[PDB]
Amino acid sequence: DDIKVAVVGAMSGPIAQWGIMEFNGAEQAIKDINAKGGIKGDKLVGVEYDDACDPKQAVAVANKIVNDGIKYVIGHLCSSSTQPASDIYEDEGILMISPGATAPELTQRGYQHIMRTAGLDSSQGPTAAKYILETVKPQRIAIIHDKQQYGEGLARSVQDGLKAANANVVFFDGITAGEKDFSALIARLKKENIDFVYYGGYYPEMGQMLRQARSVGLKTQFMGPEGVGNASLSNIAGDAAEGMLVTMPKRYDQDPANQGIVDALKADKKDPSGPYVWITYAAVQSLATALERTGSDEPLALVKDLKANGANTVIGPLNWDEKGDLKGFDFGVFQWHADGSSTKAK
């Protein structure tokens, strides 16, 4: 009449400013819910554990939650401590809802008790493609990446979405990440007369390009994935960063509807801006409430109801595929500024 829920994450290595957001999000979650009557009168209590975000610690954590009778795990923060844990959870018929792991493989196995409230990086490719096609509507598009799984992966995605829709992509090329001079690339957008570049990679590269493209006078508009929306971007491109398009999680902290949680957090002296605050709250309110409110105690009856019906969340309405990934989950589009600040885009 006291439902026990495990919250696992790093409350100690160097990743702990990340675990702080999730512990924080979970806690506010059990409180709001038990405050409204809880689960049919029963109350939810959070048992908290340290992962330190370590693969050997993770595995020890999950053994100790098992042989300790908890049935619902709202965790692991890192993709590298989770995987190992998830083997153990599935094994022993224990529910596991990750509020931050994005390794596409967690779900490529057949585990029937593993879910996520976190989005996959690949969902950004399609958000970009749709934005460029619906609202930018540029004339000549060159697509570039940095020869890596991340950057190459996300560029091809966008190139895919862009052609299926018959858009005009001039060239598709790779750059040597670590490169300090893009004068050839830059001379090629001049000549190919390019007006919109989608670049999949990281900030280091993007910053030099932007800096590099603007000194030569290009009017070209740049798009990039979350790896480009870093704080260093402005300490690197300076002004050329201005108006760079980026794909980033939406700011749940700025939803009129979340203003109640935000105040609650400011009040406790906690920072309500971390995304882990929001995707972990979304986790608690789906296991517990969307579902235990289904009458079951049983881990599997629980995943069947969330996969059949959805959770209504702080993070929006959620739907899951039969593999336990979110369906229809999108990242936001943001317009960057020379100051390192960000307006959400048109």
From Swiss-Prot:
Domain of life: Bacteria
UniProt entry tagged with the keyword Signal: yes
Entry keyword set: Amino-acid transport, Disulfide bond, Periplasm, Signal, Transport
Localization per Swiss-Prot or TrEMBL: Periplasm
Entry's Gene Ontology cellular component terms: ATP-binding cassette (ABC) transporter complex, substrate-binding subunit-containing; membrane; outer membrane-bounded periplasmic space
Main localization, broad class: periplasm
One GO MF term attached to the UniProt entry: L-leucine binding
UniProt keyword annotation of Ribonucleoprotein present: no
Single GO BP term: phenylalanine transport
Gene3D superfamilies per UniProt: 3.40.50.2300
Disulfide bond residue pairs: 53-78
Function: This protein is a component of the leucine-specific transport system, which is one of the two periplasmic binding protein-dependent transport systems of the high-affinity transport of the branched-chain amino acids in E.coli.
Family according to the record: Belongs to the leucine-binding protein family.
NCBIfam families: PRK15404.1 (NF011933)
Protein name: Leucine-specific-binding protein
Phylogenetic placement of the source organism: Bacteria, Pseudomonadati, Pseudomonadota, Gammaproteobacteria, Enterobacterales
